[model samples]
Target: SAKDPMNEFSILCRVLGTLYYRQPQDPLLVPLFTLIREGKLAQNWPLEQDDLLERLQKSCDMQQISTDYNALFVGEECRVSPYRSAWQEGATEAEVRAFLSERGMPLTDTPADHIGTLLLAASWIEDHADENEAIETLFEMYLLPWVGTFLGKVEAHATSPFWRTLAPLTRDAIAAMWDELEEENEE
Candidate 1:
């Protein structure tokens, strides 16, 4: 059921969002990395795409993972811009902030349109079966439009294999979930 927190797609977004939002050293990712390393993520995730999880299970460099995260998303030389404003001309930080605020979601230190915030927001809204319209509007405007480009950048950030795998997994999971929703909406 959509109302269940067990919805795998939402879990994936939460998982991916958390991964994107925090440094590898964050305590939140500690047991999460353990689950990935132990191959437990695939068991709990959406779809049958455990192949990437298997690869991720094999590739976590706990020592340098933090370094990779900092280089890829943090600092002035960050390889990828994880925010929607960078990807789409029409989407701005102010609008995204207002949108989130309207829904009672807190603003993180990161830009409001950050892929991490967007994914987490999407997951939170979708967890409510009654927020189906909210989900659609969110995806149509703030998320679906630019999330793919962000994911592609991460997928192409070849120097970080462990984090790289997460983008593709996020992409696949979102695509599958979107297709499912499209079908339901049409009916």
Candidate 2:
């Protein structure tokens, strides 16, 4: 059902590392990290809750893109499916799988799934980059190819502040990281 907790931790850490490097100024990350730390109790980061949701809402409202996560995953319904019904009909796991399958993503073996594989990959790089360059290759395969488009759609239509905040935060962070790489290459 799940791998070793460290695998999860390592994966989450790498993803966080990516997020950390990408959006070092993100208000969400601190809260997210705090949550992760408390929940995992093994990792550490700085965050508090009182201001977290408020900051999240402010960030969502500031997003220059859409916030519709469902629309990105499933085409919008011709008629609004009532909220409860939509959960059953519109955003089913099969729908998510079909969406990724259409784009040729092979399913992962673990229960904690989705494109979050990008994190496992980034973690591997962060862990093993002492010897090889596979991390960059993983980013090319896992992060760059679909994240922008997926995030674009999320920013466009995600009604939840959490998802909305994630969109621009992710995009800006990725852009900065890529720029950093360019500078590294030049040097």
Candidate 3:
């Protein structure tokens, strides 16, 4: 029960708590911010790249805000570098940010913050209450960003059920969200 609960909640909190603090850390942050950044959003709704980066930096500052991550992998900090080889191979933040920015997106200050996640989850919950956006956003923003590359690293090197389950879940959910949002925008 503890393992199951930890598996579920760790994913939930790590994704949610981290996102609650940023706009850019999460994968979907770019898309959401893009809508606003490119002047696609109503003028009243303004989302700034700098502000999102700030939020992400703040979330990184609150590493212990929740023990969900610690519960799964004790004594380890939730860091991007640990999984560097797991995702990037020789991946530097530069490569990742380059990918993002090439498409007209930019990186947050820390670049590892999950702010996009928080905003998505909050919007999802607000728009479709009773649905948990944490898990969903995790699938989209965190996993979809470079899932294959990430999984490749894991397959070639590391092993952990925590990441295994999370990676797929976030990837699938985010894909679905993309469809939903695209359809919504078309209307």
Best by lDDT: 1
Model 2's alpha-carbon lDDT is 0.43
lDDT of 3 by residue, 66-119 (tens): 333333322344433223324534545554445344433334574532334332
What lDDT tens digits, residue by residue, belong to model 2 across residues 25-128? 35755655454334442233222223433444354332331223333432346222212223322434454445334444455543212444445444554454
TM-score of each: 0.89, 0.45, 0.31
Report the lDDT tens digits of candidate 1 across residue range 1-187. Answer: 3433325567777888888887888885789999988999887777788788998998888866787778778965789878788889877899988887877777866678877888888777766544667667777888788888878887787476787777788888778888877665655
Task: Give every collision pair in model 1.
Answer: none
Ranking by lDDT: 1, 2, 3
1 versus 3: better TM-score goes to: 1
Off by over 4 Å in 1: 1-6, 127-130
For candidate 2, give the lDDT of residue 149: 66
Residue 71 displacement (Å), model 1: 1.3
Residue 167, candidate 3: how far off, in angstroms?
Answer: 1.0
Point to the candidate with the largest TM-score.
1
Query: Candidate 2: worst 10 consecutive residues by lDDT?
Result: 78-87
lDDT (CA) for every model shown? 0.78, 0.43, 0.38
Error of 3 at 14 (Å): 7.5
* Model 3: lowest-lDDT 10 consecutive positions: 1-10
Q: Give the CA lDDT, 0 to 100, for residue 73 in model 1.
A: 85
List CA RMSD, all candidates: 2.4, 12.0, 15.7
